[PDB]
Design a protein around this ligand. Structure first.
Ligand SMILES: O=C(O)C(F)(F)C(F)(F)C(F)(F)C(F)(F)C(F)(F)C(F)(F)C(F)(F)F
Ligand SMILES: O=C(O)C(F)(F)C(F)(F)C(F)(F)C(F)(F)C(F)(F)C(F)(F)C(F)(F)F
Length: 134
């Protein structure tokens, strides 16, 4: 169970680019966009056998997803979309696709330098969020 060894630990947000535009394209409502943009989340990534957990903690809301690489699962996103999610390990990157309502979005969680970078894409709109170790 070593696929995710470069991701495990705790992380805190450094910077965010185009995040509100990404959320707009996804369809997130105004108030959720404003709370999300204001959060300084702490991310916890952990491995228990085959099951990986990604937890995001912020002042007003936490999320927690647990999954096996390659196995589709149900996710209720923070903006309350009911999506079908699959996360795979491709070239050292966690590639997460969410499918719902005839639409898709991809969240790539990757390593760059000493950082964990989250790249979100919806119909050509890309957000880049950089985390440092907590
Ligand atoms: O509208 C809500 O219910 C909310 F709580 F404001 C929220 F925006 F969804 C949120 F969950 F807090 C959040 F900000 F989106 C978040 F916590 F999920 C996040 F985006 F900050 C993180 F990065 F933690 F996921
Ligand atoms: O920083 C991250 O870990 C993240 F993955 F980029 C994310 F911010 F959590 C997010 F997935 F983009 C997101 F915030 F959850 C969201 F934008 F997708 C959303 F729409 F679910 C919400 F509602 F939280 F904004």
């Amino acid at each position: 169970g070593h696929m995710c060894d470069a991701f495990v630990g705790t992380w805190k947000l450094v910077s965010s680019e185009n995040f509100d535009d990404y959320m707009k394209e996804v369809g997130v409502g105004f108030a959720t966009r404003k709370v999300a943009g204001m959060a300084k989340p702490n991310m916890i990534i952990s491995v228990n056998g085959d099951v990986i957990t990604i937890k995001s903690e912020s002042t007003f809301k936490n999320t927690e997803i647990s999954f096996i690489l390659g196995q589709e699962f149900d996710e209720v996103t923070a903006d309350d979309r009911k999506v079908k999610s699959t996360i795979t390990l491709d070239g050292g990157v966690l590639v997460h696709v969410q499918k719902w309502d005839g639409k898709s979005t991809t969240i790539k969680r990757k390593r760059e330098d000493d950082k964990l970078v989250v790249e979100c894409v919806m119909k050509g709109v890309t957000s880049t969020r950089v985390y440092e170790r907590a």
